[PDB]
Amino acid sequence: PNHPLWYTLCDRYGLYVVDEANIETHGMVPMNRLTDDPRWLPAMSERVTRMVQRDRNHPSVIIWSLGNESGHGANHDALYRWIKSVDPSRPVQYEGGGADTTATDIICPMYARVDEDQPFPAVPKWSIKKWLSLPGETRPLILCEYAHAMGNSLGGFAKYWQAFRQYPRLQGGFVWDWVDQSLIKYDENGNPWSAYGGDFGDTPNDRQFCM
Amino acid sequence: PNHPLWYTLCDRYGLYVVDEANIETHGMVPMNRLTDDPRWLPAMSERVTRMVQRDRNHPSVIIWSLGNESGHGANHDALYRWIKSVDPSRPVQYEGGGADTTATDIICPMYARVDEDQPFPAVPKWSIKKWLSLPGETRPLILCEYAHAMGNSLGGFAKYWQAFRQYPRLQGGFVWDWVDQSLIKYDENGNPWSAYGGDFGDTPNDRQFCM
Ligand code: NA
Ligand code: NA
Ligand code: NA
Ligand code: NA
Numbered sequence: 552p553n554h555p556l557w558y559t560l561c562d563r564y565g566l567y568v569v570d571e572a573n574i575e576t577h578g579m580v581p582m583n584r585l586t587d588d589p590r591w592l593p594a595m596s597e598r599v600t601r602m603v604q605r606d607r608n609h610p611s612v613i614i615w616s617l618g619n620e621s622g623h624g625a626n627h628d629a630l631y632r633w634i635k636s637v638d639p640s641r642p643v644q645y646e647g648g649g650a651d652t653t654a655t656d657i658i659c660p661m662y663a664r665v666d667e668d669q670p671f672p673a674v675p676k677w678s679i680k681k682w683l684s685l686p687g688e689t690r691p692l693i694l695c696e697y698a699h700a701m702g703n704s705l706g707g708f709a710k711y712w713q714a715f716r717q718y719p720r721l722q723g724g725f726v727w728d729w730v731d732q733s734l735i736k737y738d739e740n741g742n743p744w745s746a747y748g749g750d751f752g753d754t755p756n757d758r759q760f761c762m
Numbered sequence: 763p764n765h766p767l768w769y770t771l772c773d774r775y776g777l778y779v780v781d782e783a784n785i786e787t788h789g790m791v792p793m794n795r796l797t798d799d800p801r802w803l804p805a806m807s808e809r810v811t812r813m814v815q816r817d818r819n820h821p822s823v824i825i826w827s828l829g830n831e832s833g834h835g836a837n838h839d840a841l842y843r844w845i846k847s848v849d850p851s852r853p854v855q856y857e858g859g860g861a862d863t864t865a866t867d868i869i870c871p872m873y874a875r876v877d878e879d880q881p882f883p884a885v886p887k888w889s890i891k892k893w894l895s896l897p898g899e900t901r902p903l904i905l906c907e908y909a910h911a912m913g914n915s916l917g918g919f920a921k922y923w924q925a926f927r928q929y930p931r932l933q934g935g936f937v938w939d940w941v942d943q944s945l946i947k948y949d950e951n952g953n954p955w956s957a958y959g960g961d962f963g964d965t966p967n968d969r970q971f972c973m
Pocket of ligand 1: 714715716717718719720721722723
């Protein structure tokens with residue numbers, strides 16, 4: 552959840568907002584270790600329910616998200632249902648555990664390609680075109696993350712947009728991401744420069760991957 | 763319906779057969795002029811019912827077809843239902859009226875392309891990959907006719923097969939077609955040569971389009 556002013560500005564200027572609970576357990580092995588554990592349901596529930604209680608009157612918020620990169624655990628299903636019950640006005644989405652779980656109203660993969668399949672075990676990233684028509688699948692598809700804009704990037708961006716326009720059920724995506732997470736440091740002469748991971752003596756670090 | 767021996771041979775040698783009623787009204791304007799007419803329901807019914815009565819015990823027959831290029835009329839819907847009631851063991855397909863009507867269990871277009879839409883009014887031929895995922899669509903897609911093998915042809919054949927293998931619900935198709943419809947004529951020296959439309963003084967005719 553963002554600073555409260557963000558929603559007011561999105562209401563007034565006009566932007567569709569996905570409001571996302573502060574839950575990410577990416578570094579767990581496996582990713583759902585905490586999210587499939589009922590001992591962690593109370594802490595997770597507060598991050599979801601208190602978001603909804605705060606932001607539910609904002610017209611700019613059109614979709615609730617259960618968080619990010621926390622696998623798919625039973626706690627996700629419980630909290631998916633909680634939202635559906637308390638606020639029927641907004642779809643609920645969540646990408647974890649394969650982007651098309653029972654905890655999402657929208658097929659919301661991250662970095663699924665347009666034409667090329669990436670058949671990872673358990674959590675494949677199918678071509679977005681192929682994903683829509685898998686036996687029994689009926690949901691819309693909007694990428695929660697795509698076209699990773701790191702440095703000299705956005706090659707093949709037009710390929711996504713051609714697909715989006717041709718396929719009714721491909722309804723777009725969210726580019727990753729808006730702004731480089733570089734920080735200002737100062738040299739000997741007091742001149743500013745853009746810094747990334749490791750530049751503060753932080754270790755271990757992931758270097759430029761924050762930009 | 764074919765010569766009775768054809769089905770015996772397909773039973774014993776092993777080929778899947780689509781058994782198709784002798785109903786084609788292509789030259790009508792519009793194409794469904796007779797098939798939407800209840801006066802023509804009796805004649806149409808006999809061409810469907812008498813085929814099913816004859817061929818229903820052949821294991822090689824796996825799908826029934828209501829005919830070819832007769833648009834989509836209420837007579838098709840009536841006869842689709844007759845077959846489903848009398849023989850639940852086999853799906854029913856029919857391409858007329860846009861390949862995805864209420865008179866077909868299988869999306870069965872003719873010459874729909876792999877990636878390219880052909881958005882004809884009323885009877886569009888969508889990209890096969892796109893067709894599967896149109897809002898609400900759940901049926902398998904098998905082209906009743908594709909890769910028109912006229913003369914020096916079959917360019918782009920590999921594109922269909924790549925798509926068939928990638929997409930579960932793209933379950934193949936039937937090439938058009940097996941054998942040139944050329945006829946033997948003899949010259950002044952009694953030498954045989956291959957003839958087509960117009961070579962018998964038949965007029966009007968469509969020349970080499972039978973090959
Ligand atoms: Na679209
Ligand atoms: Na990053
Ligand atoms: Na297939
Ligand atoms: Na022909």
